[PDB]
Design a protein around this ligand. Sequence first.
Ligand SMILES: O=c1ccn([C@@H]2O[C@H](COP(=O)(O)NP(=O)(O)OP(=O)(O)O)[C@@H](O)[C@H]2O)c(=O)[nH]1
Ligand SMILES: [Mg+2]
Length: 345
Amino acid sequence: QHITVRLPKKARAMIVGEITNVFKDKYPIADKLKVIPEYDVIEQDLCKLLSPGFPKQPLRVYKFGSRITGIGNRSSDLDLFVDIGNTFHTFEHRASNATVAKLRAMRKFFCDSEDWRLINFIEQARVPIIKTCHLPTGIECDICLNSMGFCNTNLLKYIFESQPLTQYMCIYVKNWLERCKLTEQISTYSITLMVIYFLQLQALLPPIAMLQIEDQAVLVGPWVVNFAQKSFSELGLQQLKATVPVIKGFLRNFFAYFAKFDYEHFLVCPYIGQANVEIAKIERMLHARYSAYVSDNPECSIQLKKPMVVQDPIQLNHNVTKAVTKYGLQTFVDYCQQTAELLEE
Ligand SMILES: O=c1ccn([C@@H]2O[C@H](COP(=O)(O)NP(=O)(O)OP(=O)(O)O)[C@@H](O)[C@H]2O)c(=O)[nH]1
Ligand SMILES: [Mg+2]
């Protein structure tokens, strides 16, 4: 514990190499993948496959995840939420056995169909998923019955489009995480929220709470999933031109910030969007819907007694890094420190 975990060579080679890849090559690819014809085919085939099994039931498919927000690549999976029976606005604190049952019933169709290959069936994840290759396109699809990802995907799109610097940084840190082999502890989504929070502290992104001042709210259970698509100019937020030197400097400060962050006392909190949000105080700073929810359901409050706390800005009871261990956090912090050193001018 007294020794820093050495930054893996595969990451080191990417950092000391020019960041020009993302600006010139990976960004155009990521932006194209927000919309391609292949997704239409997948959604159609999913409807063709499943609606026979649920003939008299409403059915809609939603695309979400890294491809749809604009930080994906060629090899990314496509994340799909299949809503059977208009469950969109229903929130399940934990995947209900009925929901698992629904997914199990859906698995059979992928095994018997010719256009699909069942790759994996994951019942015991936070979000149970069917992992299946859409053979006509070769795209690996992760199919779930949870609407929240679609909702926070629409928020990230608004953020990325309003402040492209955010998207460049998420592409960079996503690749960094993969080269550091930290994906088992710190997910792409977690680090996306950390980029967003870091830029909120630079007065370049709004607190999400400032986009949900109600006058109306769209809810999934107790969570407010819509938001006002405010002009950044009416928020006084300047929209930066992303240049290689601008991205490099913000990346350097991003890594230095999370290298020195106090994870024992503070949490990453894009909902509040302010510095030094205390773990001991966050639950009283959340609004009436959260307060009422945990009052009646104390067991569903955010998990704060964990090495690393990164709060989802919509599903406010979700610590996205709740799985990070003491040593996983140490590794992340050590890598951030060495990365910042390598990015120094
Ligand atoms: O803790 C989590 C993880 C994931 N998600 C939601 O699930 C989506 C897909 O989750 P994901 O694990 O596929 N992460 P993603 O951003 O797609 O990146 P990649 O590694 O390229 O797949 C994310 O983009 C979020 O919308 C959550 O809402 N909470
Ligand atoms: Mg994904």
